[PDB]
Symmetry: C3
Subunit: 373 residues, 3 copies
């Protein structure tokens, strides 16, 4: 029977993973640093090193922003420094595409995976001076007229699903085939939004936005990988299922929302969706659930497995990340039982809006597994 | 002789639990919503759905409170919106009671099980606008004279011990049996305490309390259960030990405290106590340990397993929920090694007070397992 | 080869550990309490009880500090009340030394092991009055001229590695035992640093420091151990490897730093280093990474396994303890793969400074396993 072959192949994959993790040599190492002015260039193609099993990339981004307006200030948007990177794209040595998503979606996934705001500093009552000492992720709440602010942001670009689950990792042992990590950074057009404009992709918004400009952006890419891979009789001990599976983040935009009607976003088939993020960009307005009747995941036979009002939806998210996502951002965890259908559209994500402004749209971000072939 | 029969029956139960969790698909859906004026009615009986394996109920409570006093305001008590529900009682299909406890004890257990204040929003230094966006559990610190405040509270009523441990869950396949979830809500008599009165059960206290009233109370009950239970050769694959065990929360009151003398609350026998909460209601005064010499758990043979000063007792609790329970509330975790005696009164919970005001009492809250037969 | 014997002995050690943890009687009880004036005495030798397997000691320290200066105030140092204990040393019944380290290093390890500032109270949006109720660890941020402040501090002195890993525990059944816990407390010379002086070891610093004095210090030592050890056919069931292993905390000082040059602190051999703490005492100045180029761990010729700038180094720490350590404190976790070297100097901890003041030094704190023989 073929079901036993599967059982055997998965047991062997798990065994190989455990052997690799036990015997391999975990390394994190810089591969590239660069400082630039986004007025000159904002898209960069980073070439990682071809060594061992690649697990992911830590992208450090710093920036200096000057407000040269005469009188008016500017204030952080909801996403703030998470919009320093507009887009990230990874291609493996076979030129197979993995993650392609926005900076803010990648950041929200980093938060979901950590269980708390990514790389944040928790506030406590400790008299010992713990706290925001090193400003790992940091941005001034406002930039006054004539002032210059310093920003720092970190993104984890995952290939492997986690430090102990190598599903999605990349074997980069061929010298000639090239990894490609594409970073598209913010610039003076995307980062600053005037009053009344849509702040989705911007870092600061306010009456002084027209006279704000980047002084510089700097990035440093660190590559996390496993060296000194174990070797056995038949050859390198490798988890074949893990290394032949893609773990990808992607996002898309959907429109056509109308008040009091279910707006359904179908899940594709053959993808194992681990998480879903839905941002209700209600025509440049981001509200704390007040413009939604309910959200749900639905099988299409009218059976809702979790049809909830917005506050109760947020309650489940508070159990995942110990806080709320920013206004208009809704998270759905399916990690223990991924959405997996055999026929396209057998499951959908549902938002029933109560208020729909002009140009309202739903930005969907997905976390999923899929096989190469 | 029969130790293997036990071992076998336990191995079968565990395996069946894993199969049920693996093959069934979890569902959470609304079962009842109602708005009312506590001046007319404050006791309600919710009728859950009889489907699959029932794990628990999420009770969302919203309320509007108006301070009609001319000049004086009111402020939250230590328990605040946790007293929106005064009492909860659950009857399973076979008319067996599970949880029967107060709202504040249920909330403190929800917190203990989460490892942090239930459904709270942690504060961090993140510049990304995480935080208290959705006001999942919320209540104004004060309600000024003439003002109206909005409250939201959530309670999880557990049947199953947790999402992965179905001990205590309820099989709702029986045709002739109605579950009963009984909820007693706060009213205009319990929710508001005058200056100098006992705030234990109240939501607000202050000089304006006599003229405070509910505008309205609303509740929504969600039921969490497992559907599509797996079927095997003999029939449904079910963990018989899990479904024949009761996971209950209960509360009691004890009086007779006198300064500098050990006040002992005996644990009953046949119950496997998982946690203990002791509230020192010192005649309407709730103090931060300054009225207690020490607390302990003690066996009949005179041995103290943890006789500690109140600060050190609170230190262990800080390792459990990352903060302190409100003033006068003391928590004891026995989940790894439940208090389980064969003879009533073999083990007791000890409080040695140093100050005892008139009408002092110890409100006990218990979390325990027990068998149906 | 006979390496099978190891396999068997370790499987037997883990089996004996599991049996002891299941059958034994966990107890935490007070062994000594004393109030003293540090002007008279600040060094104490605590004699624990000789019962069962000893896992560790919880040291509660309270203090009253008066600022007698006429006009000036004092403010907490970065380490603050963690310097109430200057040094702690444990000797087992065989007079073998286990932990020998400073108070601040012990506290930082307690924090690393908890995953958050040790015994801290997290801040949340909860309206229920959770929070800093009991002041488990507490110290006023400043003490005004003429004012008296009250301090409370807790240290966990570990013998066993954790509550479930008895590696490092001590068997205390032999009479004529020399079990000794030595505590060297702060006094009126170490606790108070003048402006411009080195605040490393002090609790308060400021222009009023010269006139600050302890009114009193009090300590209470609790001993955590296992009673009622199980007895088998051959005799007492004991994990021989666990009880013959030392789990120690130690610290040392290192000097000879020069700008832009790698300063390497070699790891000794035969020690299994679990964690490393490095404090850059830059001549009494403690900076948030701005005086360091990068930190790293490095092999003889296998290069750097994690060569990172200070902010990225701090990012990894934020994933461990949900915040930053105080200024100048850098943490490195090696718990899953301890640094174990066949030959001395095979591995080293590296700091490359960019600014080195006079009398700069690197205070190293280590967590490690080692065998008795
Ligand atoms: C898929 N299902 C297992 C999830 C049910 C989790 N469910 C829960 C369970 C155990 C303890 C506390 C809670 S609170 C809660 C709050 C909001 C929501 Cl939406 C659900 C829950
Ligand atoms: C009763 N026993 C099983 C628990 C001992 C736990 N014990 C402990 C152990 C390992 C690391 C840190 C700590 S802190 C602590 C603080 C207060 C109290 Cl009361 C106990 C402890
Ligand atoms: C420990 N290293 C060897 C493994 C890479 C961990 N790596 C990581 C991995 C998975 C998810 C998020 C992160 S963030 C991060 C931040 C700073 C640093 Cl220094 C590393 C990481
Ligand atoms: Cl009504
Ligand atoms: Cl003295
Ligand atoms: Cl680390
Ligand atoms: Na250009
Ligand atoms: Na709130
Ligand atoms: Na009334
Ligand atoms: Na405090
Ligand atoms: Na002095």
């Amino acid at each position: 029977q073929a079901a036993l072959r599967n059982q055997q192949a998965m047991a062997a994959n798990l065994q190989a993973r455990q052997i690799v993790l036990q015997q391999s040599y975990p390394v994190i190492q810089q591969v590239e640093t660069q400082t630039f002015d986004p007025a000159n260039r904002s898209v960069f193609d980073v070439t990682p090193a071809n060594v061992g099993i690649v697990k992911g990339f830590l992208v450090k981004v710093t920036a200096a922003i000057t407000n040269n307006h005469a009188t008016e200030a500017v204030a952080l948007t909801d996403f703030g420094p998470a919009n320093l990177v507009q887009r990230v794209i990874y291609y493996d040595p076979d030129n197979q595409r993995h993650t392609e998503t926005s900076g803010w979606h990648l950041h929200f996934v980093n938060t979901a995976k950590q269980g708390a705001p990514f790389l944040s500093s928790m506030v406590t009552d400790s008299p010992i001076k713990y706290g925001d000492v090193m400003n790992v992720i940091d941005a001034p709440a406002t930039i006054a007229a004539g002032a210059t602010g310093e920003l720092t942001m970190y993104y984890w670009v995952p290939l492997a699903y986690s430090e102990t689950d190598l599903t999605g990792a990349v074997l980069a042992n061929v010298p000639q085939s090239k990894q490609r990590l594409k970073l598209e950074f913010a610039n003076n057009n995307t980062a600053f939004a005037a009053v009344g404009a849509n702040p989705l992709e911007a870092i600061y918004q306010g009456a002084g936005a027209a006279d704000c400009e980047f002084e510089e952006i700097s990035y440093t890419v660190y590559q996390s990988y496993l060296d000194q891979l174990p070797v056995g009789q038949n050859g390198y001990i490798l988890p074949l299922i893990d290394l032949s599976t893609l773990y990808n983040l992607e996002n898309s935009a959907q429109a056509g929302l109308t008040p009091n009607v279910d707006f359904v976003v179908q899940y594709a088939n053959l993808y194992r969706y681990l998480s879903t993020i839905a941002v209700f960009d209600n025509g440049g307005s981001f509200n704390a659930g007040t413009d939604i009747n309910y959200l749900s995941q639905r099988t299409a036979n009218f059976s809702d497995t979790r049809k909830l009002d917005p506050k109760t939806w947020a309650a489940q998210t508070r159990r995942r990340i110990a806080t709320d996502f920013p206004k208009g951002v809704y998270y759905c965890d399916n990690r223990d039982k991924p959405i997996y259908t055999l026929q396209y559209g057998n499951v959908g994500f549902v938002v029933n809006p109560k208020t729909v402004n002009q140009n309202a749209r739903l930005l969907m971000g997905y976390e999923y597994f899929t096989s190469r072939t």
